[PDB]
Amino acid sequence: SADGLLASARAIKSKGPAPVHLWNPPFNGDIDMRIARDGTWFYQGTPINRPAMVRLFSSILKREEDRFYLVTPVEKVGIRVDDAPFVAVDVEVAGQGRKQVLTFTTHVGDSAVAGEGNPIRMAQDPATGEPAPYVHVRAGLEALIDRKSFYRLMDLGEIEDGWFGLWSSGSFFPLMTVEELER
């Protein structure tokens, strides 16, 4: 129907994240694309080991309600996202204590400064029931924070009014109860 993976990638050009909320093209169907929980894109069930192309398609990700699309000015297609569209693979701290700022980098190279504009959210693992936290990157597209980055964040956490969590950019993001941290 009737332009494929590589052809579609050749039609896109991006210097960066596209202003997809300017665009409301008609829906052309769902494609067999799935962003796995670990950030891997699958096409027709086969992974794409191709970070350039993953960055290119990621530039045109758009969230509507709870679903995800790839959107250009002329076309919109639905994709499947298992969990978050991105994985946060790095976190950088600056400053100290309650004044600290956390800058995250995602697996496609985007940067998100944690704070009110890009909040950190606590969720639990569907599977484990263990804490799985996210950070907002843009326009409702969130990054799941990976193990390596999570464990470094534990060491930069703080307690305020019953909750263990993270200060970034002057705002406090609860992650779990004190009770929970103590377990």
Author numbering: 10 to 192
From the paper:
To extend the structural coverage of proteins with uncharacterized biological function, we targeted Pfam protein family Pfam06938 (DUF1285), for which we determined the structures of two representative members. The first structural representatives of the DUF1285 family revealed a novel fold consisting of repeated motifs. The structures revealed a conserved core with domain duplication and a superficial similarity of the C-terminal domain to pleckstrin homology-like folds. The conservation of the domain interface indicates a potential binding site that is likely to involve a nucleotide-based ligand, with genome-context and gene-fusion analyses additionally supporting a role for this family in signal transduction, possibly during oxidative stress.
The SPO0140 gene of Silicibacter pomeroyi DSS-­3, a marine α-proteobacterium, encodes a protein with a molecular weight of 21.2 kDa (residues 1–193) and a calculated iso­electric point of 5.7. The crystal structure of SPO0140 was determined to 2.5 Å resolution using the MAD method. The final model included two protomers (residues 10–192 for chain A, residues 10–193 for chain B), one glycerol molecule and 186 water molecules in the asymmetric unit. SPO0140 is an α/β protein comprising two domains. The N-­terminal domain (residues 10–93) consists of a β-meander–α-­helix–β-meander core (residues 24–92), with the two β-meanders hydrogen bonding along the first and sixth strands to form a twisted mixed six-stranded β-sheet. Two N-terminal helices (H1 and H2) pack against the sheet and complete this domain. SPO0140 crystallized with two monomers (A and B) in the asymmetric unit. The largest packing interface buries ∼810 Å2 of solvent-accessible surface per monomer and involves mainly helix H1, strand β1 and the H3–β4 loop from the N-terminal domain and helix H4 and strands β14–β15 from the C-terminal domain. However, packing analysis using PISA suggests that this would not be a stable dimerization interface. The results of analytical size-exclusion chromatography (anSEC) support the assignment of a monomer as the quaternary state in solution for SPO0140.
